[PDB]
Design a protein around this ligand. Structure first.
Ligand code: AMP
Ligand code: AMP
Ligand code: AMP
Ligand code: AMP
Ligand code: AMP
Ligand code: AMP
Lengths: 308, 305, 308, 305, 308, 305
């Protein structure tokens, strides 16, 4: 009575998850109508079932968000026992506060929408701010890429015992100090004032830029130059969410990165074809395991510091 | 105390409404971030004000819906006294029942999202099903294009007194009989055999007017027009309140035998009127502006029905 | 842990349902106090149980509605695992819109009342408008009489392959075309302007008036005359809900119907005694089966086009 | 800005209230359809108005309750600014606890239905249990008949200074001690042995006044009166705020030894006063009208307590 | 999958309950931060578990209430299957109405807080007013001390067949008549006007003052004098909740009580050390049994008139 | 129409606010019953009024929180038009995430309790995390001490133009870079090795100003000051908006090398300034009073940011 459904035609990650659980993805008719309205029909009974819907990897976020909400709704009114939204990269997470401005908190609205659509549980990876768990009243499991990142560092960078973990911004300090302490190495922080400042020593060390996401990549690219200017041996960037919109791929191809490392929370295949610096960490096992534990009532806490 | 804001790049209807009320549209930045995420910034204080957000006309339904919800949210947490969503064409209204499938009721989800976003009131025109009003617990005013459609028929069709109001499908029966009763004329109905088309009612030697709440790809309305011609209708008109016209619609209309296709201003038509000569629009900005002023003043809105 | 309860002293339908499930109806003290207030007490534990309450067949709708709400409430606060309202004929369904008027949407209020009383699930047959499912946030199963109606037609009307399915009003068009297409026959539509108009051919054919309900029967009786005037061979009327209030029974006894066919969503025994034209389709098996499937997490979709 | 509407055929209390406020009752059609379903139609715009619906006095509790809820709903979706339910006698108030049974708390269900219907405020008189106020999250004003009952006792009973205020049962203890303390007089209590009746307190050679929130079949109050007579009470009175008087109540009172039975105007009594001479009514329309005006004006309503 | 947790360091009652169920109390870090903020961490997984949290016996009610709410919250967002608040003595129960005053109904706010914190079920003993069950929408089990009180009376007071059960106030009448009828004895009632009045005969009989709680004990102490003045042979006081704040212990030591009997809904050990008149009825078995039944879907109604 | 009430025995901030608005504090009895239960009684009618409750300064966080919630509840069921909670230092704000533990989000629970109590609006100062605003669905105005802190630095520190704004931990990075950018000065950060302290950034031969949202036991801030001294900082200041100062805090500060510790008026400091000479307070009553007046009048509150 566990049922996994995928969004749109980006089965990629959701197929890996379903594979790892020994399951076929449930039958869904999932497209757009002529007037661009989202079209969904659940192709099998979900009555009394433990349902998991994995958010599509299309790229048009509002389409994918609506598709997800519509799928949640269809399953809830079709008498699913429980519906869990598996949202590897949480949409609108960077709008999680007003910022001294007359702005929306779109991440709270998104939480409210998921809730009224009928979500009983959220599974996500590396929320932009941990406080977003509090934007819901339903339980959220915020998985970490940290264990898989630590693992990637230790087996891919020889100098890891003498590297510096660097935040590209002021907001990422906690995350980098946390990784630096686990590895027992130094940390540094970049802050943009339209000019960057670096605090911390990177001289004659490998520098690893660590952030939760990379979008247009303006920031990591400038930070990498800054670090080389400060005497870093070579620069890596490791993000969980590889968004890479706009000129990101052009920017990465022209930057001084040894490698840009991301998870597959977002589909990366097409971006990798035009960008050889990108390497992907498969996190499908961490997601599959969290679903399996969720379903069985077993500890998901294991995953926060352990790689399956 | 009153503030009107518009969604994104379409401002034409919103401007017309603001004009009729002696107001400038509120300043707002409505864009998309690099990654396609909707960006909204309310450019002025809305604290203690009666706010009206008029839904955009920028085609991408999900972007327009998210933009609307975000605007509502931003206004509500910025201490607006009241927030009304003015949504001329209600999105997802055709998904208002399961229809024997394991389907979503997307129109109820939309109602729930608008409500949780913080809408206190909905103003809309010709809901696909009048029951959608009950998908909310907040008040909805469902305005009708009918009086204006009635006006247009009497004013533009010379043989209107001996005409037939035709429904493109089985579902639109009540809509056309209402119009046929008002004009004291005949009605007829078309149905697709579940496909061949069947017509019930007399259209021979008389002007046939196809009436429906909306026309999308216009496949139904264009096939219906052929069938009405074969049945000996003098000339065929198509009158829809919501002119979506997506996909092959414009090419289909031009190839069809329509004397005229009449739509309201609920969706922008300017772009489509340029490539389709037989389209005429009824301006409905006065109905909407008048519902906003009357909503704000506590005056009767039923007069407009 | 399935428990069926019945409303008031009209056990009739609910006893048939309980019979078909191999169950006795749960013990309820269910009456009115002296001041006409509804009196309910659940005579056995419902703690952790899957509870089904079938709406009474009394006739005083507000009494029956309140009784149902009170029973739902008593079971919810008595720690029932789930409470399902089995409402064969949904009250106030004809007040499902404003109708250009300053009117209530009583069907939405009724939905809101059921929800706040503690209903987790609704089972009903042939909602007056399918959009009423959207008046709830909880799952609703809207069963169809269509399969049993098609079955009744094919085995009771010899001329069924050459009949016309007729809507008594403009609102019933979809329903009749749907039945006409399945049978592969013609459809027609009556519309009242205080004068009726018929569109569609009924000449020298059996006419079957098909609607969701028959109340005072003014409309079906006038439509039957109209159809005979248009050359119909004989007229049948088949409704799911036989309300038959006011002068309906007198009206049917004086009309030109071959037969008036209804379901037992409403008790019909007393009405049949004073009206020989009425025949009943037993739908207790469709209801019993939907409860059994609901309880077991099995497909209720089977019932929408299949007769058990 | 203020509108008072009445429930169904009983308009007497509602008229008295509307009179005291210089208003006509709002026009509304309150009927039943052929199949017993409650029909309601608000005959005028309530948009932006402060609406008060006064619960009917047409006996059938479930019809009256549904009529009230439907009226509230119709007003709320018709964009009333605020809707207050004025419910002199709160329905289902005696079902306010489980009482060791697998029973409903019907009074909470009623509170929940009123709230979901869209009531913003409740005005009522002498709730069976004062805790019912907490069955809502909306404000409730619970008015008391006590000051008017006190007035009536002093005004109509000559030996009131040496009288005893008697409770018909164990539950009504706090109600009678409150009244006995206010008049500086004795109290006593009756209890049914779980039946024989037991009396605690002195009533010998003094006027006994039975006080309770309500009298329904009047079996308790009539048996209590007999027991009070056997205990040597000079004369026995019965004073209840809510005079339901269902079933054999009227015949029971006439056969009983009551000097007078006093009730308020919370339920219509005119019909019953014709067949029962000893019933007197305290008009409470002024208390209710005054709570409505004060609710509307933001003035103190506690003065009326 | 039953898990019992206790509040603060007053494991006392909760340990007895856990003992009787064959369980160890779940691991909780439960204290105050330096700024007096409540500190909680659930020391084990509660995912998919049936969770019971027993309210602490500290004495600082607002601390204990917040601790409970915080524990409920932590368990709910940690994916507990169900969370039940076991609140032997319900806080703020004496603020269950306005009382002709511009007062809060704090007991309703407390109910609303428990509900929004994530409580699915309440287990309590002898609510100050039964109407407080209606302050919730979730099921409440209001257990009675009555069976254990009747038992205590019959085996500790020889003259029980000829005693008088006395209410210390007007509000306790129903409770005492109920006990008096079961025992088949007389009842009496005290009412404070700043002077007490007694109605009912206590002359040459054992008088038992019965109330739901004893706080400062001003009222029971004055009532006991009054009863002796009226000719009672000896006076007992039996309350379910022994609060005994302020000068209660001094007051009881100086009063004419044969004995003051309370339950262990509140810890009593320290109070008994300074007051020899106090005897305790252990109600841990009634609570343990209600939890066990709750968990198993078995009848809790048994406990309302039966002692396990 | 406006009413300001204060929580319990601390009235100093509340008086200052009421003074600035030309008002007396509303009469309210805020005590504890014998058994430690919070007692509240609203001493006047709040019916139809815009009510502001200013959170107490009586140290016991749970008593103060319950007192606030009870006051809100009493006002809401007493038919206040609107209830705003003015909470200078938001309780449980540090518990705003799970932080890898099976922990509560106590700040969300608090948000939910305030909301269910009946708060319509929150006014607070320097939320520990700005995301706490989204723990509500009601509007929150999050005021900043920053402009006043900026003023104090320029006004009281002579070498401010060549100074360094230092963060006591990793988390406070964004707070100090904001201040360093505004003054056009350097920033630095301290981190505890997970313990030895590490400093990143230049502080040698320049005045170092430790800035944080709050200081509790002051262990972090005092150890940070030592490390800043060892790194050759001329003089060290500590500036916090919320000066909790619990436990050994006062003794720690006196033993530390601080030139001055600056806090706002969000928590009472009078008692602590008597035993700690280096503490200076910025009065923030004008910011709060001004947000209340502007909230009430519908005027811009963003001006104060
Ligand atoms: N999809 C997006 N792409 C780029 N920037 C965004 C997006 N959503 C929000 N923002 C902005 O990013 C900032 C969030 O700050 P932080 O959370 O500290 O990175 C805010 O100023 C937002 O306006
Ligand atoms: N945006 C849309 N475009 C085309 N068809 C739709 C859309 N939304 C819903 N539908 C379908 O339209 C069909 C008929 O709707 P109706 O005319 O209301 O009976 C249903 O089967 C829906 O699945
Ligand atoms: N119980 C009832 N009996 C008769 N008519 C009703 C009832 N409830 C609602 N109506 C009316 O029936 C009409 C519903 O239209 P329709 O849904 O198209 O049949 C509305 O005008 C209602 O006022
Ligand atoms: N309308 C009613 N008529 C008669 N008795 C009722 C009514 N509603 C509830 N009751 C019962 O009255 C009894 C006593 O109520 P109370 O006086 O509040 O203790 C309870 O056992 C209820 O079941
Ligand atoms: N913790 C408490 N201690 C003492 N008295 C209280 C407490 N809580 C509420 N009260 C008061 O006790 C009375 C409750 O009345 P009753 O419920 O009849 O005992 C009210 O006047 C309350 O103000
Ligand atoms: N009142 C409090 N006093 C001390 N520490 C707290 C308090 N509330 C939460 N914390 C802890 O403070 C730590 C750091 O919070 P933050 O500075 O937001 O990362 C977390 O691990 C919390 O458990």
């Amino acid at each position: 009575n566990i049922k996994i459904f995928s969004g749109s035609s980006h089965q990629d990650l959701s197929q890996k998850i379903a594979d790892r659980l020994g399951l076929e993805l449930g039958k869904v008719v999932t497209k757009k109508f002529s007037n661009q309205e989202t079209c969904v029909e659940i192709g099998e009974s979900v009555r009394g079932e433990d349902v998991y819907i994995v958010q599509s990897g299309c790229g048009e976020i509002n389409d994918n968000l609506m598709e997800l909400l519509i799928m949640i709704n269809a399953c809830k009114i079709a008498s699913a026992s429980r519906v869990t939204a598996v949202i590897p990269c949480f949409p609108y997470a960077r709008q999680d506060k007003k910022d001294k401005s007359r702005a929306p908190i779109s991440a709270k609205l998104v939480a409210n929408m998921l809730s009224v659509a009928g979500a009983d549980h959220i599974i996500t990876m590396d929320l932009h701010a941990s406080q977003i768990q509090g934007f819901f009243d339903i339980p959220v499991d915020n998985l970490y890429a940290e264990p898989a990142v630590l693992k990637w560092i230790r087996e891919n960078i020889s100098e890891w015992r003498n590297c510096t973990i660097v935040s590209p911004d002021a907001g990422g300090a906690k995350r980098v100090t946390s990784i630096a302490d686990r590895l027992n190495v130094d940390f540094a922080l970049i802050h943009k004032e339209d000019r960057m400042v670096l605090v911390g020593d990177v001289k004659d060390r490998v520098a690893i830029l660590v952030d939760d996401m990379a979008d247009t990549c303006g920031t990591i690219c400038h930070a990498a130059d800054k670090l080389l200017s400060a005497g870093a041996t070579r620069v890596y960037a490791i993000l969980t969410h590889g968004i890479f919109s706009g000129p990101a791929i052009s920017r990465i191809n022209n930057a001084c990165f040894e490698a840009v490392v991301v998870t597959n929370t977002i589909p990366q295949e097409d971006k990798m074809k035009h960008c050889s610096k990108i390497q992907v960490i498969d996190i499908s096992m961490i997601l599959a395991e969290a679903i399996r534990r969720t379903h069985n009532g077993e500890s998901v806490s294991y995953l926060f510091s352990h790689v399956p």
